[PDB]
């Protein structure tokens, strides 16, 4: 009966939240036991339930964000947190298309006088 | 049975926050 993140992947948001609340209640009851003479078994359970809560919240955040990305996929304007991070300078570069652009003057020059492959006899 | 066990693509609109939904409505 451990909370493994694989068992939470498909569940629905209201289901997971209910599961979260049980863990939040279970923890607050333990925090009481910490100061009222809880058994060493109950003190060790706190970390087990702190991380279980974090496991549930991770899966809730991941499931929400994976669906938000599906939602804004085709949209021209996406929320900043859904945009590629990289670095600030790497986000201000000319993109792939703009770097590949050439003027018609340069395009003509490469067509007429392409670099050739040759050899010079010994 | 305890021993037997122990020895071995589209948006989901329910997961979108309620705020985003209203904006498209």
């Amino acid at each position: 009966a451990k909370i493994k993140a694989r068992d939470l992947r498909g569940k629905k948001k209201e289901e997971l939240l209910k599961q979260l609340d049980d863990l939040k209640v279970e923890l607050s009851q333990l925090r009481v036991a910490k100061v009222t003479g809880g058994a060493a078994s109950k003190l060790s359970k706190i970390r087990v339930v702190r991380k279980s809560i974090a496991r549930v919240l991770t899966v809730i955040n991941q499931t929400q964000k994976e669906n938000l990305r599906k939602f804004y996929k085709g949209k021209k304007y996406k929320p900043l947190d859904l945009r590629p991070k990289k670095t600030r300078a790497m986000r201000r570069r000319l993109n792939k298309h703009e770097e590949s652009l050439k003027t018609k003057k340069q395009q003509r020059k490469e067509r007429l006088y392409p670099l050739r492959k040759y050899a010079v006899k010994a | 049975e305890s021993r037997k066990r122990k020895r071995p693509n589209d948006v989901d609109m329910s997961w979108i926050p309620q705020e985003t939904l209203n904006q498209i409505n």
Binding site: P84, K85, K86, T87, M90 | -
Partner: protein, 86 residues
Amino acid sequence: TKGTSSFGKRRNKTHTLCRRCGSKAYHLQKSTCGKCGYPAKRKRKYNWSAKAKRRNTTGTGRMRHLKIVYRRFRHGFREGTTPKPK
């Protein structure tokens, strides 16, 4: 009476903690830090004190975000991918 007797009269704090650099060099009356120059936008830094620069330069603190860039840089800042699942 410019020594021991006068040292008893001092009960008024000239400086207090600065909220930018956290050092007790924030002049209350001038509203300025004698260490970091707050509220000035730019950090107060001088080359006639190398020892002072190395006390508060990059890397002397947590490097909360920079040291993750150093990790991400080694994989070309890959994003939106995960290792092939089991």
